[PDB]
Each structure stands twice: as structure tokens, then as C-alpha cells.
Amino acid sequence: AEQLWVTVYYGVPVWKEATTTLFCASDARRNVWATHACVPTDPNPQEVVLENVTENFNMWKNNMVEQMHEDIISLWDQSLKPCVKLTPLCVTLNCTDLRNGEIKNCSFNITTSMRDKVQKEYALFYKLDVVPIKNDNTSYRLISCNTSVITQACPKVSFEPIPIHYCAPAGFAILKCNDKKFNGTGPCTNVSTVQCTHGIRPVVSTQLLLNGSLAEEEVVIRSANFTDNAKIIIVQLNKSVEINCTRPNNNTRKSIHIGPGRWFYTTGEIIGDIRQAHCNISGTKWNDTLKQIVVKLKEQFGNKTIVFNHSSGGDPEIVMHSFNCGGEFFYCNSTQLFNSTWIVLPCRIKQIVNMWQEVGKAMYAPPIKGQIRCSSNITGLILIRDGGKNRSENTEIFRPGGGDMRDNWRSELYKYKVVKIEPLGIAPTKCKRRVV
Amino acid sequence: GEIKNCSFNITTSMRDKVQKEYALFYKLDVVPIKNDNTSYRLISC
Numbered sequence A: 001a002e003q004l005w006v007t008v009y010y011g012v013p014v015w016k017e018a019t020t021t022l023f024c025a026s027d028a029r030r031n032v033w034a035t036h037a038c039v040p041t042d043p044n045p046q047e048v049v050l051e052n053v054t055e056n057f058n059m060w061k062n063n064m065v066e067q068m069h070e071d072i073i074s075l076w077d078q079s080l081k082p083c084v085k086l087t088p089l090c091v092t093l094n095c096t097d098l099r100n101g102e103i104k105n106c107s108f109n110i111t112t113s114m115r116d117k118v119q120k121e122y123a124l125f126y127k128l129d130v131v132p133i134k135n136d137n138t139s140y141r142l143i144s145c146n147t148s149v150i151t152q153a154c155p156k157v158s159f160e161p162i163p164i165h166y167c168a169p170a171g172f173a174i175l176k177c178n179d180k181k182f183n184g185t186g187p188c189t190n191v192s193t194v195q196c197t198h199g200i201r202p203v204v205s206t207q208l209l210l211n212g213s214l215a216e217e218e219v220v221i222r223s224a225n226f227t228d229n230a231k232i233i234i235v236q237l238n239k240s241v242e243i244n245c246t247r248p249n250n251n252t253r254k255s256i257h258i259g260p261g262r263w264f265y266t267t268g269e270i271i272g273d274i275r276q277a278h279c280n281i282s283g284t285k286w287n288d289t290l291k292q293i294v295v296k297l298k299e300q301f302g303n304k305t306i307v308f309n310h311s312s313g314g315d316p317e318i319v320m321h322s323f324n325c326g327g328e329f330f331y332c333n334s335t336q337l338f339n340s341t342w343i344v345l346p347c348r349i350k351q352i353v354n355m356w357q358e359v360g361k362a363m364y365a366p367p368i369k370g371q372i373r374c375s376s377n378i379t380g381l382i383l384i385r386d387g388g389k390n391r392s393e394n395t396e397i398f399r400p401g402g403g404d405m406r407d408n409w410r411s412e413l414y415k416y417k418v419v420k421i422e423p424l425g426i427a428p429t430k431c432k433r434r435v436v
Numbered sequence B: 001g002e003i004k005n006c007s008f009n010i011t012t013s014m015r016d017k018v019q020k021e022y023a024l025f026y027k028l029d030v031v032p033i034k035n036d037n038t039s040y041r042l043i044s045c
């Protein structure tokens, strides 16, 4: 061969997988995710295809879901830091049934003029927020009394999800898998480089994925391993299913004095009949959606297998479907969607809630005045396998489930991978440097 | 005697489940109240 000599090159387009922090970006305008500090979005972002190069994607290793997990919780706690403690409101409640029982009409006597202007301030309380005192009437008190000090969320904080974007830092790039058939992992062929991702709204829910993206012209079902009962099945829907939710009760609210310079909002009277929360779901769209899902499930789980039975498994907040329409947390019985194996949902409202899990300090929602209405659609859902059974293709009871809230972002992040680019490299050449 | 066996009565149900909860205390952690029995309290008071 030729006498070869070392030549140094810079700008070499090669890279290695790496994990780092992506910068937030937002369509700039006390909403939790509406941080005062965030990069304005690019009105004309670029995307280029590699084509000579493929890349190994694995949605179960995208560490970006961890960044979102921690940052989102931090933002929640920060916005709701200067909020009102319920500590002096642990006073026992003399409760009777509210005439029309999920709502009790109770009284108490605290603080009784501890350098302030206060009184008994009777009010309405929800069953799901209190603990019975079986040694009394039965009487009630705040369920938090024997656990922790919790605060009433600041009335000035909105909880509307914001579609936050995330962009690569210098020296790093975001690769995207554009294969319509891409599942949990593999050598994605259609790979492109993206300057910055689209916005993902931090929607928090249990059992069904709401207001997300749609599948590429068919239902696509993903899992780490369809044979492993310890894994979950992620279903991305071809078209979404329409759901319309309402809180028909027109509620008032009252500010009460709890100390000098301190106020607390209580549920006031209710105007009109007291009715149940519920959501209306189109059976047509729901059933047709299931048809496509079943067809795909057959590919792995058998051609005559009975699927989709009633809700079961986990504590009440896992067994019920959960969402936060209007700022109030609704827990509805999804069984009405899965009450027939191979639509109006009854629903209750809770105010003392836990953002995915909370230790010690927790959030109590304020009462919302008026009526709550919203509209959304089911764009995905999580199925769980019921466990061991006869191998024969008889049953596989894909119950709704999933309590790991991180999957509400992983379900979108699966498209992306972050790498570190190494511009420095060498190769042989023909001649020696003309060294004197 | 370096260890005293003492009682008290606090918080007496300030929205809680409490009682007199007698316990052992060390001499070196308390201050005598020479106007009482002598009785004691936390030296940090």
C-alpha cells in the first residue's frame, strides 16, 4: 500500500449514546408548568433525515422520562408552596347527612377567638376526604389528621397542562424514529435528527391516556415482552374515543377565618338537585376502537381469547379511572367500558389527593364555584394481564390498569433518542507534514 | 440517681391522640425548678 500518515480531522459526524438534560421550551406567554423561565420555541424548526445511517431505539431506556418526572414534581411543589395549612381544621366534625350520602353537612367550634374573628362556620365536606370516628356518632375528621399536615392549594394556581417542548443542548442531538411500525425497540431504519421536540402536555391520569398522540393509521400495541406478566401493554389508538365529562352540581363556596390574617375556603351550599358526576362516552367510537385492538391482540394472544372484563386490582384510585377535569379530581368506574367481554360512567369526586404519591405534605383542592364541563378523547390506554392461566386460548383478561404515572410521558417519548456527538477524529493520508 | 422517672400532661388532645406518657429523662438534659418539688424541665426552655 501507500505509505500512510496520520491526519487529524475535525467535524467528524459520529456519535455515541449519552444521557443529559434537555432545555425546556414553551410558547411563551401561576400555572404549574407555565414557568417564568423557559426558552421560546422555534417558529421554523428543522428536521433532516440521515438515511445512510440507522439507529437502535429502545423506549424503555429513554431517561428523559426521569427528567420530566422530577422537574414536574418540583414545579408543582414550588407553585403551591405558600399555601394554607389545614392543621387547625383537624377539629372533629359533627356531621349529618346532607338532604337531597356522599356529602355531609357538619359543624365544629375552632379557633374560638384565638386573637381573631372566627366562628363555628358549618360547611359541606366530602366522604372521600374524611375518616369516620367509629367511637363517636359516627363523627368525622380530616383523613390527614393521623398522617401529615396538608395544605389547601393556592386559588391563584391553574392546573391546565402546558405543551412544553424540549430541545438539545450544545454538543448533543435528538434522533427520532419515524418507522410507523416501531414498537418497544429495534434498529429503526427511518431515523432523522430533530432540533427540538414538539410539546407534550403533562396530562395525569390512570387506566386511559387522554389528549395524546394517535397511532400511524392502525392501532399499535407495544410491550417489553408480551409473554411476561410483570410487564404492561401500551395501546396507541388509531383514532380517539370521544368523552364528555360534567359536574352538574352548581356549587358555591365560602371563605372562613381560621386565624389572624388567615383564610380557608369551604364548600358552600349547592344550587339545584345534587347529582352524580359522570362522563358520557360514545359507544360507537369505543366499540369500534376495541374491534381494532382485539384484532391486533389476536396476533400475540390467540384468535378466540376472551378479553376485557370489569375493573379490578389496586386501591380505589387504581381501580377507578382518574382525571382532573376543571381542577377537581374525578374517579370514575371504567367498568362500564369493560362490562362486557369479547356509555355513562358513574363517578365520585375527591379533594385530598396525592400527586402520583405524596409523603407527608399533600394537596387539598379548593372548592370550585359553579359547574365543571370539559371535553377530551381517549388516545391510548394501558392493559394489564390478570396472571397465570391455562395455556389454551380461552381467556386473557386485559383489565385496565397502571399506576406508574411515568408511563404518561414515556408513551410519547418512545419516538426520541439523545446522543453525544464527537467531532474529533483521525484517519490515514498519503503524505508527511512538511516539517522543518 | 442520674435518671428520673417523670410525668407531664400535654398536649391534652389538641386535635390529636396524646396522653401523659411518663418517661425516663437524664439529669444532664434537664434544669431543676428549685421553686417546686424540686421539679424539672428541659434545660433548653
Ligand SMILES: *[C@@H]1O[C@H](CO)[C@@H](O[C@@H]2O[C@H](CO)[C@@H](O[C@@H]3O[C@H](CO[C@H]4O[C@H](CO)[C@@H](O)[C@H](O)[C@@H]4O)[C@@H](O)[C@H](O[C@H]4O[C@H](CO)[C@@H](O)[C@H](O)[C@@H]4O)[C@@H]3O)[C@H](O)[C@H]2NC(C)=O)[C@H](O)[C@H]1NC(C)=O
Pocket: A158, A159, A160, A161, A203, A210, A211, A323, A324, A325, A373, A374, A375, A376, A377
Ligand atoms: C383535553 O383538551 C381539551 C382542549 O384543550 C381540554 O378541554 C378544555 O379545557 C379548558 C381548560 O381551561 C377549558 O377552558 C375553560 O373554558 C371556560 C368556558 O369556556 C367557554 O369560554 C371560553 C372563554 O375564552 C372559550 O374559549 C371557550 O371556547 C368556551 O366558549 C372558561 O371560562 C375558562 O376560563 C376560566 O377558568 C380558568 C381556570 O383556570 C381561569 O383561569 C380563567 O381566568 C377563567 O376564569 C377556561 O378557559 C375548555 O373549555 C375545555 N374545552 C371544552 C370543550 O370544554 C380538556 O380538559 C383536556 N383534557 C385533559 C385530560 O387534560
Ligand SMILES: *[C@@H]1O[C@H](CO)[C@@H](O[C@@H]2O[C@H](CO)[C@@H](O)[C@H](O)[C@H]2NC(C)=O)[C@H](O)[C@H]1NC(C)=O
Pocket: A179, A181, A182, A183, A184, A185, A186, A187
Ligand atoms: C417489534 O418488536 C419485536 C419484538 O421485540 C422486534 O423483533 C426483535 O427486535 C430485536 C431488536 O434488537 C431483535 O434482537 C430480535 O431478534 C427481534 N425478534 C424477532 C423474532 O424478529 C421487532 O423488530 C419490532 N418491530 C419494529 C418495527 O421495531
Ligand SMILES: *[C@@H]1O[C@H](CO)[C@@H](O)[C@H](O)[C@H]1NC(C)=O
Pocket: A093, A094, A095, A136, A137, A139
Ligand atoms: C352533634 O350535635 C347534636 C345535637 O343535638 C349533639 O347531640 C351531639 O352530641 C353532637 N355531637 C358532637 C360530636 O358533639
Ligand SMILES: *[C@@H]1O[C@H](CO)[C@@H](O)[C@H](O)[C@H]1NC(C)=O
Pocket: A217, A218, A219, A238, A239, A292
Ligand atoms: C385506521 O383509521 C383509518 C381512518 O380512516 C381507517 O381508514 C383505517 O382502516 C384504520 N385502520 C384499521 C387497521 O382499520
Ligand SMILES: *[C@@H]1O[C@H](CO)[C@@H](O)[C@H](O)[C@H]1NC(C)=O
Pocket: A239, A240, A376, A377
Ligand atoms: C381529540 O381531542 C382534541 C381536542 O382539541 C381534538 O383537537 C382532536 O381532533 C381529537 N381527536 C380526534 C381523533 O377527534
Ligand SMILES: *[C@@H]1O[C@H](CO)[C@@H](O)[C@H](O)[C@H]1NC(C)=O
Pocket: A250, A251, A271, A370, A371
Ligand atoms: C349557580 O346558581 C346561582 C343561583 O343564583 C346562579 O346565579 C349561578 O349562575 C349558577 N351557576 C352556574 C354555573 O350555573
